[PDB]
Design an enzyme around this catalytic site. Sequence first.
Site, PDB file in Angstrom:
ATOM      1  N   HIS B  47       0.853  -1.181   0.000  1.00 51.12           N
ATOM      2  CA  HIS B  47       0.000   0.000   0.000  1.00 51.12           C
ATOM      3  C   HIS B  47       0.891   1.235   0.000  1.00 51.12           C
ATOM      4  O   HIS B  47       0.679   2.155  -0.786  1.00 51.12           O
ATOM      5  CB  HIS B  47      -0.921   0.008   1.217  1.00 51.12           C
ATOM      6  CG  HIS B  47      -1.886   1.140   1.223  1.00 51.12           C
ATOM      7  ND1 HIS B  47      -1.750   2.242   2.055  1.00 51.12           N
ATOM      8  CD2 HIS B  47      -3.004   1.381   0.491  1.00 51.12           C
ATOM      9  CE1 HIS B  47      -2.726   3.088   1.835  1.00 51.12           C
ATOM     10  NE2 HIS B  47      -3.510   2.587   0.881  1.00 51.12           N
ATOM     11  N   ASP B  89      -6.177   2.219  -2.140  1.00 48.24           N
ATOM     12  CA  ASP B  89      -6.853   1.952  -0.877  1.00 48.24           C
ATOM     13  C   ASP B  89      -7.698   0.686  -0.979  1.00 48.24           C
ATOM     14  O   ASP B  89      -7.686  -0.159  -0.080  1.00 48.24           O
ATOM     15  CB  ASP B  89      -7.737   3.141  -0.487  1.00 48.24           C
ATOM     16  CG  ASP B  89      -6.931   4.330   0.013  1.00 48.24           C
ATOM     17  OD1 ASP B  89      -5.697   4.218   0.123  1.00 48.24           O
ATOM     18  OD2 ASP B  89      -7.532   5.380   0.307  1.00 48.24           O
TER      19      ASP B  89
END
Lengths: 5, 121
Positions: B47, B89
């Site tokens: 991420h 996300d």
Amino acid sequence: ALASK
Amino acid sequence: SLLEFGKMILEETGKLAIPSYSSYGCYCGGCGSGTPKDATDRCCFVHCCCYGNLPDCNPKSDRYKYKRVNGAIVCEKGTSCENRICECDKAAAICFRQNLNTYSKKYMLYPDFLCKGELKC
């Protein structure tokens, strides 16, 4: 807290 | 923005972004360096790497809109930064959901010195 990093 | 991401995580995992994923492992929160400790931690590493491909964007503060189509996460049309931020996300949320089984409280508030800093994205 909830609204962040 | 952190607002959308934290809501996405809650819906998916049932856990709150803070304090569950705010200070977990070496890459969840103050992600910085070291070797990812586990699957959930790899989720944050990737991420963090995902945000890294968007230098001129602002992931923490830029808001995007997204919807649920029968449990499925769908990023709605916005700016390029917003579309790409949402995609990043969305992946983490799914990744987190995929590794709930191996989430360990043993990694909450993980100390800094225990991170062996070396994974290049």
